[PDB]
């Protein structure tokens, strides 16, 4: 029996991605970036390929690598660029063309997707493998009965009994 | 003796190898068999032994003014890496001299 989030449009997005002929397309390095028509200096900067780690504020795990096949969770970012403030108001002033386009739009299911995207676009890229979460607990308090086992202070000594 | 001479020809001697590589066996043998005596004569000379997985064996020496030479010693023997160190010492006498 197969059941992997089998009650949504995502299946319709699973297929039409594996269409024969359409699934064999390939482009060379920097080739897609030529088709972009953007200024050529865009490819000179460095980019970070990664998945953001789970925030400490919440126990939520949806926007994490745990549901990797469910949602595209690989992000491409750029080095932040010079920023300053408006003399008249104090608002943050900057000239970065690539300021937010990645953190808002660029989302990928696997790291290899972003690798191919950068290669076909010519963006030099860094890979940062996210740390794996640990599910195995500690030896102490391993089970609910460990909160009240004998390991806390050892076996009770029967020396204070009447007649000892 | 070359060991006593290995204090004026260069200012630093650096060694690169791999813990588990087959071609790194010889440099491992040489270091194990010679590090104690190569340091006993000069108790302050910098001899940086560094290792990493998948790397390549090489002997690199630092000279005055930052002059530096390197020789790969992958696939050699303990006697062979000793020979390479000997050529390293040989070039060390014909170097610019600093400190003064």
């Amino acid at each position: 029996e197969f059941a992997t989030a089998s009650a949504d449009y995502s299946i319709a997005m699973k297929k039409a991605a594996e269409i024969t002929g359409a699934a064999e397309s390939a482009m060379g390095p920097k080739e897609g970036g030529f088709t972009a028509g953007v200024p050529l200096d865009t490819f000179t900067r460095k980019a970070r390929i990664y998945a953001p780690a789970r925030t400490a504020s919440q126990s939520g795990l949806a926007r994490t690598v745990d549901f990797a096949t469910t949602t595209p969770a690989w992000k491409i970012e750029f080095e932040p660029t010079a920023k300053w403030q408006n003399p008249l108001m104090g608002w943050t002033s900057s000239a970065d063309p690539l300021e937010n386009v990645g953190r808002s739009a660029l989302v990928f299911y696997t790291k290899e997707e972003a690798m191919r995207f950068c290669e076909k676009l010519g963006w030099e890229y860094e890979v940062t493998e996210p740390n794996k979460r640990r599910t195995q607990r500690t030896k102490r308090y391993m089970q609910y009965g460990d909160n009240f086992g004998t390991k806390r202070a050892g076996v009770p000594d029967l020396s204070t009994l009447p007649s000892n | 003796a070359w060991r006593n001479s290995l204090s004026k020809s260069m200012q630093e001697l650096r060694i690169h190898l791999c813990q588990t590589s087959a071609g790194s066996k010889g440099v491992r043998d040489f270091i194990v068999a010679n590090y104690a005596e190569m340091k006993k004569a000069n108790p302050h000379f910098p001899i940086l032994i560094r290792e990493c997985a998948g790397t390549e064996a090489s002997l690199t020496a630092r000279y005055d003014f930052g002059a530096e030479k390197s020789v790969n010693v992958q696939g050699a023997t303990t006697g062979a890496v000793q020979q390479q160190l000997e050529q390293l010492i040989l070039a060390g006498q014909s170097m610019p001299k600093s400190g003064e």
Binding site: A82, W84, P87, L88, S93, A95 | -
Partner: protein
């Protein structure tokens, strides 16, 4: 003083939104040469003070040349009165004159 004028408060690549940190007052700004001088200074991101004697109609072309808060219009300038001159340069470390007849 030597190069601190053009370097200390320079913020940005040098565009309209950039800040050169330079405060200057130009006299005869609405004149032929002064207009281009002001347009050149402000376009690098500098604060410009423009006091004028002629009409605001002849001076409105200067308003576009600077960003919000960097074009200072001081009407009814009197060259015989030093009060307006003192107000014109009260914040500018640079003074430029093109008043000619």
């Amino acid at each position: 003083y030597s190069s601190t004028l053009m370097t200390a408060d320079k913020l940005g690549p040098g565009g309209r939104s950039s800040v050169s940190g330079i405060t200057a007052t130009v006299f005869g700004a609405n004149g032929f040469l002064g207009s281009y001088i002001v347009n050149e200074l402000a376009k690098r991101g500098s604060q410009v003070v423009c006091p004028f004697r002629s009409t605001e109609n002849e001076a409105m072309h200067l308003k576009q040349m600077g960003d919000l808060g960097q074009i200072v219009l001081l009407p009814e300038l009197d060259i015989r009165n030093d009060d307006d001159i003192k107000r014109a340069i009260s914040r500018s470390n640079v003074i430029i004159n093109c008043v000619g007849m």
